[PDB]
Symmetry: D2
Subunit: 456 residues, 4 copies
């Protein structure tokens, strides 16, 4: 045993599962707004020997030796991070060790807030993320709502936009120590300047969580939250198209006559290690670094520009076929479809599209509160990486409308949701039209190229 045997030969059971997944990604129409296809260059670094190095600590301040080159790798990742977002190293630092987006956000709260201090984020059904604090009416669900006291703010249901007015009203009463500007299911641009004004008024930190839009921010195709945010967290995948990891950006420098300094760097870095994490995943850090260099490229500006065009084309196509869009349209990479007008819930449309290899996710619509959410969240980044263009997404909307039509017919043939799901498998004619739509979807999808390796 050398440890150099191929995965094909060493573990054939796992190799056949890698290939069944690679085929599923190649043949499916991937519309999950948070999914992207990582590049082969980054995957090489992700599955490299850097997994073998323990480098607890930070460059130059490591706890062990032999970190000579992984220090260069981490520092290179930090420089490429600041450059991909046009940041001044005198005004901004970055931590590249958060294992993912959720550990990044928990590190910020741990670094700046005391246990049970107050956090405000967009409510979960309104488009926020779990890590922004989420409690049901019966249970603290997000750990952010266990170690800290979270109170959500809401969309204005009439407009589909964040109710910056009600946020200002509630933040003055709730007195939060940190407010989160960032979304998972939101088709619009967050007014970071209005956020920073509410935060300055109530003496709170503004955290911009730009996981979904980071790739767009790096290409300068949408306004940068760095202009108004004290702290910026992000996933290194999604629109950034790297390996799954996280980043924390923070301010440095100067925040009677004396100059008050920014005090984020030491608290943030301490919260990641020693407080929360252990040994950094240097393989992820390296893969993140390759993607961050890919993001300063002109090809990323045109890809991100295409992501916007493709989402608008998908939105425009959806409106023409008679669909409703939460907040009317989109200014970023995703589209919030409201299917309650057309007579179908998102849960039904989710399963039907899943059976025809169209992966999307149900989404609560404003004024809906469920097991049967009324909407669908459709994303452009994944297919746009596969060189999709506007006409390609208009065809994607065609396949979706076919899928919705199939769901409408099954809805009249069924009572409850489980009757609906059971019908898509046992009924012969429904099974047939699904197979016909699925085959046309996969034939259309396989022709497009796919980032990464060819075999796995």
């Amino acid at each position: 045993w050398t440890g150099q045997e191929s995965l094909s030969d060493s573990d054939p059971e796992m190799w056949e599962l890698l290939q069944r997944e690679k085929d599923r990604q190649c043949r499916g129409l991937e519309l999950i707004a948070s999914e992207n296809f990582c590049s082969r260059a980054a995957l090489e670094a992700l599955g490299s020997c850097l997994n073998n190095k323990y480098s607890e600590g930070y460059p130059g301040k490591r706890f062990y030796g032999g970190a000579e080159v992984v220090d260069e790798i981490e520092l290179l990742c930090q420089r490429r991070a600041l450059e991909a977002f046009d940041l001044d190293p005198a005004q901004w630092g970055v931590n590249v060790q958060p294992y993912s987006g959720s550990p990044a956000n928990l590190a910020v709260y741990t670094a700046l807030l005391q246990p049970h201090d107050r956090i405000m984020g967009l409510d979960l059904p309104d488009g926020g993320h779990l890590t922004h604090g989420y409690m049901s009416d019966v249970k603290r669900i997000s750990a952010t709502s266990i170690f800290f006291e979270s109170m959500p703010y809401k969309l204005n249901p009439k407009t589909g936009l964040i109710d910056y007015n009600q946020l200002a009203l509630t933040a003055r009463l709730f007195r939060p120590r940190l407010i989160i500007a960032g979304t998972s299911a939101y088709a619009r641009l967050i007014d970071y300047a209005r956020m920073r004004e509410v935060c300055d008024e109530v003496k709170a930190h503004l955290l911009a969580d730009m996981a979904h839009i980071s790739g767009l921010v790096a290409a300068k195709v949408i306004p940068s939250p760095f202009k108004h945010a004290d702290i910026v967290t992000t996933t290194t995948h999604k629109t950034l198209r790297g390996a799954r990891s996280g980043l924390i950006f923070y301010r440095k420098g100067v925040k009677t006559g004396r100059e008050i300094p920014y005090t984020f760097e030491d608290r943030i870095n301490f919260a990641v290690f020693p407080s929360l994490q252990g040994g950094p995943h240097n393989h992820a850090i390296a893969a993140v670094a390759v993607a961050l260099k890919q993001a300063c490229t002109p090809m990323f500006r045109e890809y991100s520009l295409q992501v916007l065009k493709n989402a608008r084309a998908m939105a425009d196509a959806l409106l023409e076929r008679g669909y409703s869009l939460v907040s009317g349209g989109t200014d970023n990479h995703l589209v919030l479809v409201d299917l309650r007008p057309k007579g179908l819930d998102g849960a039904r449309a989710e399963r039907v599209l899943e059976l025809v290899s169209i992966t999307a996710n149900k989404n609560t619509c404003p004024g809906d509160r469920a097991i049967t959410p009324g909407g669908l969240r459709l994303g452009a980044p994944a297919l746009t990486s596969r060189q999709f263009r506007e006409d390609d997404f208009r065809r994607v909307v065609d396949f979706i409308d076919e899928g919705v039509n199939i769901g409408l017919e099954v809805k009249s043939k069924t009572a409850k949701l489980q009757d609906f799901k059971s019908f898509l498998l046992k009924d012969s004619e429904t099974s047939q039209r699904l197979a016909n739509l699925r085959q046309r979807v996969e034939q259309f999808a396989r022709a497009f190229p796919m980032p990464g390796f060819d075999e796995h």
Copy 2:
């Protein structure tokens, strides 16, 4: 732009760094106890298209669709995890989604405790890990100490062993809710039956953090903590020789007048991992973990684990018979806790001189040095070099390279006082820089001849 361009063509500056790190890995003698060299099969799955799937939730109960393949990969990783540790799927479940060792522990505390509930772990300078609760005297350092109230139990300074008697005394008073039986710098087996007695008395949870010894437990080579513990957390690297990830083992079924009082661990542990703490699972890490878990079920891994112990005893005996004391005496696992206090050098000086000759170790506070900037000795591990087909004679040669290094360190220390004057000495003085560059050339020539798991060039 296709995204299928090779890393060599796409990012040369990066590619050079992956090669330089591969070279330093190859040329060096890795003796850090937590290190290991991963198999090419696992790194193939680590850098797979599995990174491109969001599968929040759990198999059969996920939030997005299209997770049919990753559902089987997670379920496979679960079954391979139970089989690797000889567990009945009726008495044990496992969560394979923790991102690393530290997240796995935080999930267990979240799952079973309320904030500020009481926790007892081995003190950090006594060989415990940060995640077991480490407050200093001025600062709560570990996040375990902030969101929970942790009091440490100590080693007996006379024996180097865990003072199981003091732990029973201080547990009756501190009334902890969970005690952690796990180490990062401890050369002996842990009396898990004695922990379970103290835990059954104060009505506490017995969590076993076998991260450093996960491989030795799977190979049935040291006693298994699963016979006494309710919850077992582990890392998937170190002795398991996998990708960086974590696991949480928990008992399911019936605990015990009345009826069947059930084990309530599973739903709480799974809920703490998601949605409480983590987001989307790292399916590419879960797959590489599964790969390495299959490798741990095979007879080659038991012979590997048995070779780790022998190289450890060989390292200990070879160190004893050259003028070194070892706290706890010998070693019953994979590492040795050397005490450089009886040779006139400290751990900080020794690892800097050893690192300068491609020999990586780490300081470790020994039972006897209140000065923790100049710690007692070093922590040296076997599992890394053992994976390069090292045997006992190769480790007695490593001890010779080490003793030759500390003696360049004993001479360099006789000519200076403070540690930075020490360090600056090792770089400029031509007579010491030459004698270092010569020992370094001989260790690189010696290590390069051995094989190396993984790819050839990165």
Copy 3:
């Protein structure tokens, strides 16, 4: 030394201070809405031998012996408490051991809530009490805001009333586990039914803190919060006219087919003792019992009826002289005067009236946020006990208008507040007119009878 020597003979220094205070109460016009003059019968029990008995525990479940009669005293106090508020002993229990109003409220939070659980009360400048949670924008001030997380609700400044609408909006977002219905500076009737609806919607306990209005509730001259509240706390003084102590009323009995029981009694009683308090003050409990029997009397119904008439007469007199009243008037025992129209702040009017033996307290007016609050809180219970009637309070308003006029003249003669206060003492003519007003106030006040002892 027998311990039976008179205070007159044993400690003459303290005796001369008792008499200087007795004279100050006899000669002053006491307008502090929370002040009342306790009856002699209760004071006898307050300064009795019951101070000498340790009775930790509860009647029948004491931790020591010899509690044979103090058990009868505590149980008698419980029966008179339930009877004074027309409560069914099958539906209501009462704890008579809270040392005061603040320990009563802290016992409720401790009994029903976990540390850091959420509380909502009327904001402090809006008329709430400290124990309802109060944080400045810099410090947690009330211990209620330290051991639990409080968020306040506000008055509607346009109307001076509680914004029950904004409370419902914020309670749905804040998700409090207990909401407090009760005030210190509020001239209106709290809509307890609307409170109970907000509490039932967000699954919160409704605590009615009726310290200021308890005497009115016992006389059935205003609606009883017991009709809508799960828990009722109160001080045993203020409008109840007893010794300084506290009471916690709670529900008993019944809150698939099974009957869910009320679970307040054991948690409330446990929070008082063993958790929070030590040995009960049986001397206070006994004095509280005499006052509670005085409250079931027809004389208390007419006294409380007179308290309402006197406050309305004081309010009507104030309006006629050109004063503003927060929320336009009053339906209870106090009056919130807004002096910002007449050109004087409450802090100035407070000191000027204090120098003429008219004790009131400054009060923040809605839309004012200070060291110079714009209002004055005037109460009727104290003087109404001294047999004041409507024409007497109209004369009190005359003395106040004279005092305000003196403050207006000093305001033009001075710059800052400290200049104002210093002017009332050093300036000769100002000092004179104050002495003339003070003498007329005290001559008018001394003629009225005074509950309690004659000498101390």
Copy 4:
């Protein structure tokens, strides 16, 4: 209705209860260590018009006006409090507003600690008070245990004394922020210098809760904790013989390179009392406290306190020489901790038979009874009866009344098994009810002859 009607005319049913309680107080032998009989002067101020003044805030910094007289009464109570304990007003301040002993402690924790900060007090069954932190094994009982994390230190079971050695060991591990040197059932002096050493080591606050011994400290009759403690809380009754209230003593001035690091206790303590925890002060209690504090400055109180000790030693020696063991051996303060385990009766049975003959004591868990429903012995105190002009011969007579009671209890126990069968026995059996009613008649005749502080009829 004037409100000046007498209680006899206004509420006869109440008045009868005040008289019945006055009679039972007069007719009985009060031996509860925390009891005492207040002076008529203090009860005159307790039931004064001072109840009718809201004086939220502090002298010079109040929120209402018209507080000129109560400002001097509070300031007098402060000066009398410092003089009574021989404190320089430059090194000590005092807050006289705590409603009782428990509120005074909670204010100190609030003032100096954050929620869930660590606290160490004597364990409750070992003689500590609830307010020092008492969690059982199923429930946080004291509010000190809910809002703060408390670990108890124990007695040495072999000596009955505070195990100061174990406390130093468990303080280095628990890292407390505040340690409480105070007792409710402990017959020895507390090595406050040894507490200050343990506190100065783990960087903790030394709070002294002298509530049970406040009078003996003021009379310079036992060593004063003010020489070693930073904060001293006390009750104003018990040995101080005042109304029910509390005090918080704190150091002000300069603590200690650089300049004058100031004592920061005062503002935090005062702020915790108001506005944090309490509302309007009980000015009638503050005045009665001041009255009793002046009485404690006088030579009659030192002779009184000295008589308390002698009656305590007389009670201890008289109990020893009749077949009783006393934990800790003797007594150096005001109470005696008897152990009825070596005589075949328990504390629950003895206090029920003694209470039935107008002799009030209390159970106390002795060092040796895990069964705490049938506690070891009784706690008996001197300060109560000493205030009735009791001397040593009168206490040796009380011991005779006690020993005659336990022997009716040893015979009643030989004829039954469980405690309720015990209790029901003492009421129906004509031969035991007669023998109880005879001993009762002799104790009432004996106690009634002694004087009684306070009023004559209520």
